[PDB]
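Table S5 (text form). Sequence records supplied for joint modeling of the two-component complex.
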Amino acid sequence: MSPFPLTSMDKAFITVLEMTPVLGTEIINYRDGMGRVLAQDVYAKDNLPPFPASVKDGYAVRAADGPGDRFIIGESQAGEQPTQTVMPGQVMRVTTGAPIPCGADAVVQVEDTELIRESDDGTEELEVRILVQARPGQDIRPIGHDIKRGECVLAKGTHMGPSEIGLLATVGVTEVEVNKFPVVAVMSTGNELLNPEDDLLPGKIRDSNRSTLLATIQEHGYPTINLGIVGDNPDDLLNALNEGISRADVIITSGGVSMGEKDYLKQVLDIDLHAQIHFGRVFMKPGLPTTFATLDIDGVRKIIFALPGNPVSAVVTCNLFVVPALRKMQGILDPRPTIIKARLSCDVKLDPRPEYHRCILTWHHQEPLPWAQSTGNQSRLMSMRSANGLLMLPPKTEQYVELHKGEVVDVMVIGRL
Amino acid sequence: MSPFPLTSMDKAFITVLEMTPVLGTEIINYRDGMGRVLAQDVYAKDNLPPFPASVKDGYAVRAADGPGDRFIIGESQAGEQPTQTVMPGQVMRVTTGAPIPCGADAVVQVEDTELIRESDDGTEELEVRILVQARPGQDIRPIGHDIKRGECVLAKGTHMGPSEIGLLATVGVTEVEVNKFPVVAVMSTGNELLNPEDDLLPGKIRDSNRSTLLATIQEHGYPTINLGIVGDNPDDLLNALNEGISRADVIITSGGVSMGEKDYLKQVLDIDLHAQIHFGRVFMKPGLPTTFATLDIDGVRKIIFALPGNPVSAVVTCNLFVVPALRKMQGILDPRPTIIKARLSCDVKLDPRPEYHRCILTWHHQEPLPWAQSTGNQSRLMSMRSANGLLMLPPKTEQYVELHKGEVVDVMVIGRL
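The corresponding structure-token record, covering 834 residues in total, follows.
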């Protein structure tokens, strides 16, 4: 209760995912579907193609006519239903995607033909030599070849990207049920903090955590609310938390959670807000004082992350705990982060705690594993790259105390790549 | 000119990057910086910390006093400049981040002390035993330890993520010069096309390419304009292109670029728009009829991608050619896509052309390389995942005609992971 027990990193992570709710559903326009999870199955109400369609530029023929010289009776062009029937000894010009006319049963691509006659002005083809024996149905997509009416084309639980949006467009299902996205409120606490826009005053520094955290959350596509800087005292913290609860599904605070003139926050969460603190310390480096609470009001579960004030600790813990919770809330069935294998670019000393650090992942020519280079430790160009990984290093053992350059380690992906 | 020469995939890609311009600059608020590239160096105008700051909860001491019993004359708390001077035999309580008072030269963490006396109500500490010999300056961050006034903290060319936004906040540089993002207009052409919202009519299908392409571009954070469906005829195409040129930096069309009742588009680009077509066919699968043009109007270079109408071809070529061009336009110095190594989940037949296909990348327990599974080829859960990779398979040779399950191949990353 104070000091809260040290919670293992594995227990803390499982606890967050177990206790975090899945948000309810809403209907959206399909164009707004990026990153959403479907909460319904989606069915085709038409065939694709809905008419027999040519695969090629060429001619719709009767296969039974075989090769030979044919009169061209017209053309079938994309977008128009032909009105003519192809009779023996005749063909119709077709383009890719055009409907196959009545009377024809195959398409012969233009490369397997030679033109015999055209109009005097050259605009219309009149007679063509078909050089091959068409196979029945060749170069035609029959009705429903790609999608059948009544086919389920997307399952509930699908996490949508551009191709899924395109598939919704294809089948004309322009309104879909999806899980809501979490609204995430972020505040900072500490009497030393000024806004980024402020000149410094004695004893003060600028608040960076709000900005870093909001940007991290925005990067993942979730709506955010900036609740500003809150004074480190019980009344102001309670008011800010109540605003967060009212306005958002998730409240993130940073600061006020180490031991000292600080645990107003853990105290306010418990005694004033009546929230359930599930852990208040985690055996990790950085991130020791990380706190996770839930609050149930009238059948709704709010989640509260009280992150360390240290700016590095705040951003590491946001990636380890907050992002997976948000993924679960927005309906992603397996909300775990992507963890990949990479080679260390430098030796690193291990701690009794599992340790985490921002890094850059780079592939080197034809080498199969990427290299991971911890940020902050210098070339010019590499010192400029934005972090796309979080090194996840194991606790030291009486055996292994140090990992060396080249050795394969776990890296959580936190940026593109 | 028609048929345009087959351009190699390598030549086509280099051509796009060589001919694509870098957009000009603008000043933005730092909160809007995600994914932007800085067009200025950024300097600190203050020190961090700007005062000597305690690293620990404990006491500010005189090291020369050594261990022993000390009167506590007050407390230094985060955010307030202390007014008292610590004299021999005295200490001041400090919290993490608090300023070190005059007269003290070290901090002793609370764990290396024992309290002797406190006020009758327990609220104020009065006397403490210092159990250790402090080293001079111990557990103090001196002025400028982390950032010095006048230090360049971010270089021009930096592609910003959340930590860079936080660093801007730290140093109070809330307005920054960055490259503009490209505005990308997308249209579809073809007489067979209906809008997603439409019921089918004879001879028609719904347009999916606009949706897929717009979503792909939006995923990368660039503003878009939907120019709708354009009839496959010279006048309407010219008008739509002119609108695109007026409204956007990049125009993407799909359809009207194969050979037949189609190359109104390549013809309109050349004769009516007076654009320079750099290639009109690419030796690739899919994507043969992919066309890239530039148009210089009054010192401004517009870029035009005329992508194939086939919906699969359109999305593959968007990822190979369009996204890297957009990355260059928004100022990214090395706009190449991230290509990783992965193991094939299935045998695949090679083509005389290099071939590309959407896939899913998955890591398997402790195996170092991810597995790549081509989409569309079926488990239930895997058939549901959204594509995060594009398989990049080599042309066949008289030697190698087939690649087998397990073999290591190139995959372009196109989704998170």
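Note: The longest strand of chain B covers residues 68-76.
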